[PDB]
Design a protein around this ligand. Sequence first.
Ligand SMILES: [Zn+2]
Ligand SMILES: [Zn+2]
Length: 66
Amino acid sequence: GSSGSSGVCTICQEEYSEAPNEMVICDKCGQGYHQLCHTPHIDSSVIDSDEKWLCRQCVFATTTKR
Ligand SMILES: [Zn+2]
Ligand SMILES: [Zn+2]
């Protein structure tokens, strides 16, 4: 039968989104993370703009000394 896709938080697993506790989806992974859930707490500036946002796991892997 019909079947779409998922799109809920990864910390609390909640679809509800309402700033300042808005939700942000990672471009790499694809999962969502609330501003109050994601650590550190995500900033609005990122959301306000139409720029891409990456979760911590992805971000942290932005500068590697290999
Ligand atoms: Zn959450
Ligand atoms: Zn990610």
